[PDB]
Structure formats: C-alpha cells, structure tokens
Design a protein around this nucleic acid. Structure first.
Ligand code: MG
Ligand code: ZN
Ligand code: ZN
Ligand code: ZN
Ligand code: ZN
Ligand code: ZN
Ligand code: ZN
Lengths: 130, 299, 188, 111, 138, 84, 48, 56
RNA sequence: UCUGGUUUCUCUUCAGAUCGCAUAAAUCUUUCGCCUUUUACUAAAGAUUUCCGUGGAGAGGAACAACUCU
RNA sequence: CGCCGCCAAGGUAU
C-alpha cells in the first residue's frame, strides 16, 4: 500500500451534471455506512453531555484532517469550561431542596423517593373546536 | 510520498514497525491486528483475530518473530509474525491489561501491568506468573532495561518506579511529573527512558549504575493531553537522535533530543494521535490515530 | 419478507444529536401503503421529542428517493408531489391492493437487488434540477416535526400528571388545515 | 366442588388469612425416633446444614446409621422382607423376556 | 394470618405486631382497588412502595437501631416481611435510598443499561419530574 | 495554563476511575419480588372484557402454546398430605 | 459445501428455531456519514 | 391387574434404550433472560388458580 | 516457618455409565385385531427423533471467607 | 389361566 495512490486526486471538472447529493459518495442511497468498535463509556458520556448542556467533540477521520473543536451550542462549552456529567462541578448553583421522611413507621406520612415536591379562557375555545 | 492507509473500523491505539523494517503492525478498538508492507504498494495482508477486548499495545520481539498484544480482556496474546497463528494466552490479571513489554537479548521475558495495581513478570514457557508486584494504584506503562534486571513502571501516582528482579524491592522512585504517566520507552542503548504524562510534560530520565541522583535529564514541551484520556505513547528514533510523541491536538511532535527544539509538527489527522513510530533504517514516521487512518511521513 | 440493515433517515428526523441509541427488530410493523413486513427501528432524537419509530419500508423509499419516517425527499427535504410536479414525470404506481400493486412492487424489488444505491427511474432526471426547486429548499429546518403529538385530558382538563405528561400541552389544534401521490391540503 | 359461571374463588380476599386445619401429622415419640424428630415433617428435610446435605440445590446426601434405621423402621407395611434374588425365580426380567418370545406364560405372569 | 413456621416467635414480636399488621392492612388496601384512573402501572407502584417501606422499617429496626435480635430478623426475612437479596443490595456502599429491584436488572432494559431512577439529580438536568415506569418515582 | 494543568488531571483520573473499575473483562442478577405483584396484575386484567388491555390479550393467546409446559411443572410439584 | 451448509443452518434456525437460541450480542456501533444535506444541518454533524 | 402391570413393566424394561440426545437445554433459563419473564416466590393455590384463570 | 476453599447463580462443549435401580408420546417401514372411508385405534418387532431430568467441565461473581483441609 | 369400555367429518344446501 502507498499513501500517494489514495492521495492522488481525480483529474476533472468535478462533473457538475449531477447534483450535490447524488455525486456525493454513498453505499446505501443514504451515506457511506460502516461498522466500528468505539468504546461504550465515553460514547454514552459525551451523549449525556450533549443531552444536558449541548456540547460535545466532533467524531470523524477525514473531513479536514485537523479537528479538535466542539459542536452544538458553542458558548455553553466555554461557559462551563468543558465539564462532564460524571464530574462534580466547581459550584452548587440553583440547587433544589426537597423534604424527606424516611422513618418508615408512620401511616400515610412516609414520603421518601416517591415524594411530591413542596410546590405541590381556553376551555371555551376547546369547546368551540369539538 | 505521504501514503494514507485505512482499514481500521475503530480507533487505532498502536502501531509498530518490524525490527527489520519490512512490515508494519497496527491495532486498536476493533480488536484486529493488521499487517502492512512497508514498501511495494503498502499492501495489507494478514489479520490477526482472537482478542475479545481492545488491543492496547503491540510489540515485536527483537527477532521480529513474535508479536505481543495486550488486551482489555485481561489477556496478553503471543502471535507468530510469520504465519499469523496464535501461540499463547497469558491469563492472569483480574482487570484490564494496560500494557506489555518483551525483554530483548536475555531469555524470553514479558512484563504486564493492569488496573488491579499489579505488575507481573511472565516467562513465555511457564503458563504462570513468575513475579507479582502489588503497587496500590493502577499501572499504565511498563518497560525493561537492556540488562533484563530492572522493571520500570509508570502509574497514576506521578512517580516512575524501578523494580529489582532479584531483591523484589522498590529500588528507585522518580519524582518530576505532576500527573499520570501514560507511556514509557527506553533508548536503544538502555541509557535513557522517555515519558509522557497528563501534565503535558515530556521528560527524559537517565538510568545508570552511577546516576546524578536527580535524573531529570531533559524536559520538552508542546504535547497536549485532554478530556479524551487516551493513553499516550512516545518512541525513540533508531539512532536516539529524535523523540516522537503523539498528542491529542492532532499534531505529531518530533523533537531534537539535544537542543530540545521542535523539529516537526505535522498535521493531516482529524482526531487525537495515539502512537508514533520510527522506521528502524530510514527516516519514516508512522502516525496512528483515533481517526482510523495512518500516515507514512518521510523526513 | 423483508430484512434491512440501516434506513434512509433524512436529517430532520435524526434529531439535533449526533449521538443517538437505537434498538432494532427482525420483523416489526407493516407499511401503511402495501403492508410489507419491514424492520422497525426505534430511537430517541431529543429530550423533549417523541421516538418517531418508522413509517414505511425500504423498498418504497428506494422507488422515489424518500426518507424513512416522515415521507419527504432525501435530496431536498420536500414532498413527492412537488418533486414530480417540478420535473413533470410522475413514475406511476397503482392504488389498489392485489390488482397491480404488489405485482410491480415485487418486480421492482427484484430488479433492484443489484445496486441498492440509486432509485429505479429518478437516476436520469434528478440531474437536471436545482432550478425551480432550489428556491424553496429549507436549511436548518424546524424541529416541530420531532415534538410529540397532542395528548388528551388537557383539552378536557383531567390530566393528573400535569407537567410530567411527556407529549405536549396548551396546543389547541385547528380542524381546517392538516397520502402517497394525492391529495395534500397544505401543499396546495 | 364448585358450580359453573363461578370465578375460581379469587385468592386475594378469601383464604389469605385462613390457616389450614391439620395435615396427617403422625405423632412421633422421642427415644425411638429421636434423630428424625426435628425434621421428619418439613418440606426441606435438611437444606441449611452442610453436615448431611449438599446445599440449596439439594443434590447429594450423607446420613448415619441410627437415623437410617429409624427410616427403615418407619418404612414398613409397604416394604418386603425379601433379601436375595431367589424369590424372583421365573419372575426375573430375562425369564419374562423368554416367556414373551416363546408364546407361553407363567401362572400369575404376563401374557 | 398465615405464619407457615409453627414457631411462636420470641421477643420482640409483640411490639412490631400491630405496626406490621397495619402495614399489611394498608398493603391489602393497596392491592384491592381497581385500576380506573391509574393508567397501566401506577396502580402497581404503591405495592412496591409499601414493600419498600416495610423492608426499610425492618432494615432500620435491626441494622440502625440494634434493638431487635438476629433470630427474629431472620424469622421476618424467612416469613415474608423482609427480603434476603434486597438487603444485601442495601448493604453496599454507594446506595441505600433504592426504589426496588427493577432498576438493577440490566437486561430488563433492552438497551443494556440501568434506569433513569438510579441517577443523581444534581448531575441530571434541572427541572424534570420524571418517574420510573417499573418502580414509581425518584 | 494556570488551573488547566490540574483540571485535565481531574478529568483524566475521573474518567479512569470509572473506565475499568467496574470489572470490564450483573449477568445473573435478577431475583425475587413481593408475591402480591401477580395478584394485582391479574385482578387488574381479569376476564379481559375491557378496551384498555387489548394490546395484551393476543399475548394471552400467545401463551396458548406453552400451557402444558406450565401444567406439567404444576402437577410435578403437588403438595403431599403431610405438608400444609 | 460451506455455502449450502450455512444456508441450511440458517434454514434450520429459521424453520425450526424454537429450541433455545440466544439472540445476539449487540455491542457494535455503526458510523454513517451525513453526505446528503449537511452544511448547516445539525451544525457539526460530520460522520455521526 | 398383577399380570398387566408385569406386562407393562417388562415392556418398559425391554425398550430401555440409552438417551442418545447430544445437546441439552432447559427452556426456563432461556425465558428468564428475557425482560418479559420474572421470578417471584408465591403460594401454591395462587399458582394453581392463576394458571386455571389464564387457561380460561 | 512457607503452602491457603465449601455452597449458590450465569456460558461451555463432551456424553456411552441400569446417562434415569423408572419410562412417556410421536414419525416411518412391516405384520396383525376391530374396520366402510379416514383421523381417534389395537399390540408385537425393526430404527429413529422429540420431550421431563441427570453426569463432568473451562470462566465470572456473590454468599462468615478467613474457619482453616494442605 | 378370566378379551372387551368410542369421538368426529359422512345431511337438512351457498
Ligand atoms: Mg369421500
Ligand atoms: Zn411499502
Ligand atoms: Zn424523514
Ligand atoms: Zn398532559
Ligand atoms: Zn432505586
Ligand atoms: Zn422501586
Ligand atoms: Zn427506575
């Protein structure tokens, strides 16, 4: 194998007779798909990171050949200085105090993990629709 | 020519060059070990199969007949480079094997280290551990001196430890890293050992019968570690003039072992680089990374 | 009768997350047009979004370059009727059940087992495009397709769950403006 | 015991608190059935005891001689006093095979 | 009631008898009612909740308070007033505010993971009142 | 460069404290529950004359095939008259 | 022979599959490039 | 009745062929790994009335 | 002074032992006996399986694992 | 010396 053989570009005007979608490489009619063996833990960790705060690193191999940036919501990455969901943060802000009753002796008063929180004109239009 | 190789479906964690410079070996998260022609058209031939965990580290013995493979499945496999047949499974550790090294010269020896905090010496003929060194913190990188008397271990205590095979005692400790050590490698002379650590410091340590006693021989900079927590490995050039170490910032860093100037910073990779290797005769650099592609830089 | 490995999945149904987990089956649901046993796949696009499992099969998506679950085109992000009205060639397909439907469907599946890469009749006329359909080609589309459908007991005021009801709330729908060829009311 | 169009007694609110009356429960006297007195009426005879039984999957057992002699004494009225295989003359399996093959029978045997 | 152990159990059972009798009566009241209003599984939540509070009452009766003996503790485990494998899960270090045993079964979930009930709320997103469909709440 | 030199180490030994710590080399970990679960399920279902449980009743017909596999194991474990 | 053997093995594990077969070990990921639309669609979706 | 149980016992002892089955399975361990089957410890009459209820 | 492990739960193939100190059904190919045609059948042989269970072996845990066999 | 113990399709059309 030689890097020069795969690195050698195709001589041509890119053939703009096709569109941008059909001239793109594929194997299925929708994108080039191939299986791999990525670790599960960091995968699910950055998945939960993007699910909570909306930033994660960008996985590929041959898009730009230099890529170490963050994607999604950009400013919240540098706002939190790149923390994860499994790490104890630098502060404990906007924390939400519940009440507990874990004696397991009283009747109709035991509220542990099944506890409700301390906090607990449209009908005319909905009648006119139905 | 640059030469771009592809094949690995998952992240590549390691690659090595055959001792005679005729072929390459590479492996990673997929669990497959690929062999490559160094010259010709850079063709790919045998695939070694049988590891259930990911391949953490490949090595060749000095003869280039035996290929060792440390896996996350707690087993270190011994492979025949000639046929591609498996020889032995070193079953032993209770947790992931992080790394392995094979003693050159002296009768065949193998060292392993894992997350169970132990370091084990294996004789390929016994199917059992010879010595066990309980540390207490996870062990990440291990190498033998050329006299086959000492074991050099890097863990997460920021302190490289040296073990005496006869006394079975903690002979030496090296201070000088602020964070976990991810990769150790001896010079071809046995003279110097190269270390990578999270603190982004590449440090050369000199191991000798007569030592200054404060063996921070040299320090180099530029190599960045980040949130990916990839093991980072570094290598000595065939003549000990160049030092290469991969980084997480997509650049291959090559330094001048004397002046400490950065000779090369190379791009081309999209992701973090996990290992850089030097061809034994010619100025060729094999760069392996998490973008699942390899390059053959020529200097 | 049908096995698959991966569906078409245009970008507006994948979600805003590049990291999604997906479960699969071997023989799942029937298609709502021709009742073919495809493989339904299930995933979670977003944290405030429904699952949007699978609408149609792979073969009927391979006829007209249609995505998998919301029945839009992959090449633009438009319906089928706008596409073959802009190109003026319909590539006809029957309406009944056993008259001519599954006959030509099984034959067009039989002749397309080799490629699996391009549609059967649109390969020659998707090239002369980007003139009349590029004017309405929405980039970064609205994610309101991915939000869950409306629930009951908030219309009648009976919902005991309150805020933890996962579907939607305070959305009064309108009974004035809501299949495969025709007719579609907001598209007119 | 119960008529048609009747649900099967709905065991949530019928006899959940009702104790059973009495089993057979033969009264074993001490000083003759003393090793077997504590466990002869138990659904697991020996389970949580590594001296006599294997374990919880209840596989292999080892007893002692007075405990088994009490078992042999309680196992009368259905066990023969026959010790050797001499009462089974022409009652053996092979003699019955011969009687099957030879179109004949033993008086008191099969046909 | 069914005792199934012919024991005439020792001290102290007379001081836990009306309390556990009231918990059994409330468990019968949580078992008896129909499933109108309660959707599919939230009629099955309070029987899990009352078994959890009964096992927690025996749990902090023996381990925390050290008042009841070990023989009657094993008796209450063997009869059915407490569990044997669940208290071994409560014995572990990282968790004792557990809901029930349906969040630990990693193959009960088809995605090969644990539920969202066994997640710390301080690392989870800020306002969502999510409840387990197997266990009931968190 | 001022606090990042220990923050990257915090991230590294926080990720490696759960990377291989839970024995990546629970598989047989389902056990008993309260017995008042099956009773509540079947008292909810009953004779299946409701429209709420119509997704499950076909599954009941799917339990038709393996019924003698239950009746056989039932009649294998009948209580003896010395038991209660 | 190995072609018809794997065919008849899939047939026997399809015609008569009733007796105690494990499902699969689905620990594999799949990486499919969004090479149809993405220039600003889900900004940063490069191989997904 | 004596001679007909002798007949049946000899017919059972004569066709006593060895169990030439190659593989073994259980069909309960394969149910238990599925998320839809669960193990609990109940009373006997509840199990009997349950299976006749389900059979109806 | 060093050597240092019984149960329980999950995969892993081999079974040649009354695999089980006992013994069910079905299929085929034949002989019969009731029989009108057939499924339900009768009861003997030959040869296959299915099914309720069992035997020894590789690992991963947990259960007093530190009582202590050595 | 002591066989034997019975259901249904075959009919009040589709
Ligand atoms: Mg006829
Ligand atoms: Zn279809
Ligand atoms: Zn779609
Ligand atoms: Zn609602
Ligand atoms: Zn819980
Ligand atoms: Zn719970
Ligand atoms: Zn939960």
């Amino acid at each position: 194998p030689t890097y020069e053989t795969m690195f050698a570009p195709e001589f041509g005007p890119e053939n703009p007779f096709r569109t941008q979608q059909m001239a793109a490489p594929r194997n299925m009619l929708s994108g080039y798909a191939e299986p791999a063996h990525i670790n599960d833990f960091m995968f699910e960790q950055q998945r939960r990171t993007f699910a909570t705060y909306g930033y994660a690193l960008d996985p590929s191999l041959d898009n730009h050949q230099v890529s170490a940036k963050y994607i999604g919501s950009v400013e919240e990455a540098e706002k939190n200085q790149g923390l994860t969901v499994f790490e104890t943060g630098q502060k404990k802000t906007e924390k939400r105090k519940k009440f507990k009753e874990n004696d397991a002796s009283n009747i109709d008063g035991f509220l542990g993990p099944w506890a409700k929180y301390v906090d607990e004109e449209e009908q005319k239009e909905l009648d006119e629709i139905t | 020519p640059i030469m771009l190789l592809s094949g690995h479906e998952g992240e590549v964690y390691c690659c090595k060059f055959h001792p005679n410079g005729s072929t390459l070996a590479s492996a990673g998260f997929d669990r497959l070990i690929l062999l490559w022609n160094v010259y010709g058209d850079c063709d790919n031939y045998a695939t070694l199969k049988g590891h259930s965990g990911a391949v953490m580290e490949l090595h060749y013995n000095t003869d280039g007949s035996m290929l060792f493979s440390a896996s996350t499945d707690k087993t270190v496999a011994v492979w025949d480079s000639e046929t591609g047949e498996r020889v032995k499974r070193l079953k032993g550790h209770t947790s992931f094997v992080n790394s392995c090294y094979p003693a050159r010269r002296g009768p065949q020896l193998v060292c392993t280290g894992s997350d169970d905090g132990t370091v084990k010496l294996w004789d390929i003929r016994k199917k059992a551990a010879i010595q066990t060194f309980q540390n207490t913190y996870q062990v990440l990188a291990v190498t033998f001196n050329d006299t086959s008397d000492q074991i050099i271990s890097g863990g997460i205590d920021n302190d490289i430890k040296v073990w005496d095979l006869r006394q079975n005692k903690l002979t030496y400790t090296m201070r000088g890293h602020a964070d976990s050590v991810t990769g150790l490698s001896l010079s071809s002379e046995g003279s110097y050992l190269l270390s990578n650590a999270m603190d982004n410091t590449v440090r050369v340590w000199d191991v000798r019968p007569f030592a200054p006693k404060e063996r921070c021989v040299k320090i180099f900079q530029g190599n960045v570690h980040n949130f990916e927590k990839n093991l980072l490995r570094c290598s000595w050039s065939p003549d000990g003039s160049k030092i290469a170490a991969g980084s997480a910032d997509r650049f291959v860093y090559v330094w001048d072992t004397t002046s400490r100037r950065i000779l090369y910073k190379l791009p081309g990779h999209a992701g973090s680089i996990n290992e850089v290797a030097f061809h034994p005769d010619e100025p060729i650099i094999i760069s392996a990374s998490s973008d699942k592609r390899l390059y053959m830089g020529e200097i | 009768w049908e096995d698959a490995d991966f569906p078409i999945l245009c970008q507006t149904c994948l979600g805003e997350n590049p990291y999604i987990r997906m479960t699969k089956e071997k023989y799942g649901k029937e298609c709502k047009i021709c009742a073919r046993p495809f493989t339904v796949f299930r995933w979670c696009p977003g944290v405030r979004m429904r699952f949007k499992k699978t609408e149609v099969c792979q073969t009927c998506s391979k006829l007209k370059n249609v995505c998998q679950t919301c029945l839009l085109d992959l090449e633009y992000g438009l319906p089928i009727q706008v596409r073959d009205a802009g190109l003026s060639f319909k590539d006809d397909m029957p309406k009944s059940d056993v008259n001519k439907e599954y006959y030509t469907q099984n034959m067009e599946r039989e002749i397309s087992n080799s490629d699996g890469t391009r549609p059967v009749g649109m390969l020659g006329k998707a090239t002369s495009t980007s003139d009349m359909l590029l004017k309405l080609a929405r980039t970064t589309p609205y994610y309101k397709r991915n939000r869950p459908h409306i629930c009951s007991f908030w219309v009648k005021g009976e919902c005991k769950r309150g805020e933890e009801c996962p579907y939607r709330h305070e959305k009064p729908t309108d009974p004035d403006d809501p299949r495969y060829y025709g007719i579609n009311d907001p598209v007119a | 015991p119960f008529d048609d169009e009747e649900p099967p007694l709905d065991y949530a609110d019928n006899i959940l608190d009702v104790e059973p009356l009495e089993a057979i429960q033969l009264e074993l006297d001490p000083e003759e059935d003393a090793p077997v007195l504590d466990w002869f009426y138990d659904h697991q005879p020996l389970r949580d005891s590594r001296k006599y039984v294997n374990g919880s999957t209840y596989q292999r057992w080892q007893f002692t001689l007075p405990m088994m002699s009490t078992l042999y004494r309680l196992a009368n009225q259905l066990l023969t006093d026959l010790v050797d295989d001499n009462y089974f003359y022409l009652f053996d399996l092979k003699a019955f095979f011969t009687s099957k093959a030879l179109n004949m029978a033993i008086p008191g045997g099969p046909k | 009631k069914v005792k199934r152990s012919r024991k005439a159990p020792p001290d102290g059972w007379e001081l836990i008898e009306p309390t556990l009798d009231e918990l059994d009566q409330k468990m019968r009241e949580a078992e008896t009612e129909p499933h109108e209003g309660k959707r599919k599984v939230e009629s099955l939540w309070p029987i899990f909740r009352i078994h959890h509070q009964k096992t927690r009452y025996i749990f902090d009766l023996f381990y925390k308070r050290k008042a009841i003996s070990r023989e009657l503790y094993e008796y209450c485990i063997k009869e059915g007033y407490a569990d044997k494998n669940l208290i071994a899960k409560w014995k572990k270090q990282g968790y004792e505010n557990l809901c029930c045993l349906r969040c630990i079964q990693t193959r009960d979930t088809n995605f090969g993971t644990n539920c969202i009930c066994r997640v710390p709320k301080s690392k989870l997103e800020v306002g969502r009142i999510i409840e387990c469909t197997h266990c009931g709440c968190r | 460069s001022e606090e990042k030199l220990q923050e990257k180490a915090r991230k590294w030994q926080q990720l490696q404290a759960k990377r291989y710590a839970e024995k990546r080399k629970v598989d047989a970990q389902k056990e008993d529950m309260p017995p008042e679960h099956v009773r509540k399920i079947i008292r909810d279902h009953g004779d299946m004359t409701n429209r709420k449980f119509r997704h499950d009743k076909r599954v009941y017909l799917g339990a038709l095939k393996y019924m003698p596999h239950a009746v056989l194991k039932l009649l294998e474990n009948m209580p003896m008259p010395w038991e209660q | 022979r190995v072609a018809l053997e794997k065919s008849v093995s899939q047939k026997v594990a399809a015609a008569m599959p009733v007796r105690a077969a494990d499902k699969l070990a689905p620990a594999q990921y799949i990486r499919y490039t969004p090479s149809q639309q993405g220039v600003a669609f889900n900004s940063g979706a490069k191989q997904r | 009745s004596y001679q007909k149980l002798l007949k049946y016992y000899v017919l059972n002892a004569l066709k006593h062929r060895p169990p030439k089955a190659q593989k073994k399975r259980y069909l309960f361990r394969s149910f238990k790994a599925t998320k839809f089957f669960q193990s609990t410890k109940l009373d006997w009459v509840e199990v009997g009335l349950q299976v006749c209820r389900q059979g109806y």
